[PDB]
Design an enzyme around this catalytic site. Structure first.
Site: not given
Ligand SMILES: CCCN1CCC(N(Cc2ccc3c(c2)OCO3)C(=O)Nc2cccc(C(F)(F)F)c2)CC1
Length: 366
Positions: A24, A33
């Protein structure tokens, strides 16, 4: 003391945190995000508040110091370990996941947790057949079956590593990934400073990608790698970018470039790229951008977008040397977006930079 990493020294050095660092990625500064929310570490959501100060408050609360929105890797691991504990609690009260989880060895448990982080419990629980194979230790069959899934198509390189982990019960896939990235980085690194790639290595990187260093594609790559400065390409930047882009080879990176380019068509992304360029171009010791450097970058990023670019060049070539501040750089894009083809809708009271006011006076008669 409960969260002290020393409490985990009996484990292996490879663990779920290091696994997700590879799959990730790890961010040590607060960022927004996909959905615009303040996040740090390995996907650790801080708050849905639009206030960065709010996010910093939550982070400072969690870390126990004034972080100013920047943490260390070990601090990120502490946050991540809290998140893993919560994911495991969820698994352990899920009738579809508990039996397979309980049956697995420690390494394969990490692979299952990885899946839950990526797709949630409902997503993982949909793999009923493959989970049964895992519970029965039918590793090769589980691996074959998982490779047929949409999961594999969505994230093939991560998924292959997770599947290898289920197949073997070892960390081999992650050791191999790390080595591949190290060996690739070593092709480019500055021989006098292993922490970065210098100009010669950047040129080699461009050559390997069959790109002219002067092309807009190279600036797009720097943007995707969030490079701090044009003069060097740090090891951390290189590793983080290859991770975020899902690439462990030059061929894979080459295939990703057109996808990076297409992102510029999505909402706000060209503006993000444009604003990034200022920071990347500027001398790190300076607060503003030298006019000559600003011109060079404007001509790369705005050609074919800013209908008055040629007149802008003519205007500036008459101008005295100055540092272009960030705000002036940023506002030129807004000017370009709003301005009529004949400049007839310019608002002199719009608090544009003086430079732009002066440009409109210069240009209107040409
Ligand atoms: C109008 C803007 C033109 N632009 C200015 C910057 C140039 N350059 C540094 C660089 C790259 C190659 C060079 C060189 C300098 O001197 C000779 O050969 C870089 O892009 N460096 C860079 C830094 C970090 C990451 C990257 C990237 F990831 F490869 F894209 C590039 C490339 C050309």
């Amino acid at each position: 003391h409960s969260q002290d990493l020393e409490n985990l020294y009996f484990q292996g050095s490879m663990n779920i945190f290091e696994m997700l660092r590879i799959d990730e990625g790890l961010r040590l500064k607060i960022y927004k995000d996909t959905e615009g929310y303040y996040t740090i570490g390995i996907g650790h959501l801080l708050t849905k508040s639009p206030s960065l100060n709010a996010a910093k408050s939550e982070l400072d609360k969690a870390i126990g110091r004034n972080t100013n929105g920047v943490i260390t890797k070990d601090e990120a691991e502490k946050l991540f370990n809290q998140d893993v504990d919560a994911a495991v609690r969820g698994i352990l009260r899920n009738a579809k996941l508990k039996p397979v989880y309980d049956s697995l060895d420690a390494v394969r448990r990490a692979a299952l947790i990885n899946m839950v982080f990526q797709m949630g419990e409902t997503g993982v629980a949909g793999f009923t057949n493959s989970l049964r194979m895992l519970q029965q230790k039918r590793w090769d069959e589980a691996a074959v079956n998982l490779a047929k899934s949409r999961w594999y198509n969505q994230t093939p390189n991560r998924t292959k590593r997770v599947i290898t982990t289920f197949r073997t019960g070892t960390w081999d896939a992650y050791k191999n990934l790390r080595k591949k990235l190290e060996q690739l980085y070593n092709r480019y690194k500055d021989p006098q400073d292993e922490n970065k790639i210098g100009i010669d290595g950047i040129q080699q990187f461009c050559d390997d990608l069959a790109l002219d260093p002067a092309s807009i594609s190279v600036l797009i790559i720097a943007w995707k790698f969030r490079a701090a400065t044009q003069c060097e390409f740090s090891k951390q930047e290189f590793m983080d970018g290859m991770t975020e882009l899902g690439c462990d080879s030059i061929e894979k990176l080459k295939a990703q470039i057109p996808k990076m380019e297409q992102e510029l068509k999505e909402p706000g992304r060209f503006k993000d790229f444009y604003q990034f360029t200022f920071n990347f171009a500027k001398n790190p010791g300076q607060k503003g951008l030298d006019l000559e450097m600003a011109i060079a970058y404007w001509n790369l990023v705005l050609n074919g977008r800013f209908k008055f670019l040629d007149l802008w060049n003519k205007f500036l070539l008459e101008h005295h040397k100055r540092s272009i501040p960030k705000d002036t750089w940023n506002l030129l894009l807004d000017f370009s977006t709003m301005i009529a083809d004949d400049m007839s809708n310019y608002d002199e009271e719009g608090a544009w930079p003086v430079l732009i006011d002066d440009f409109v006076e210069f240009a209107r008669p040409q």
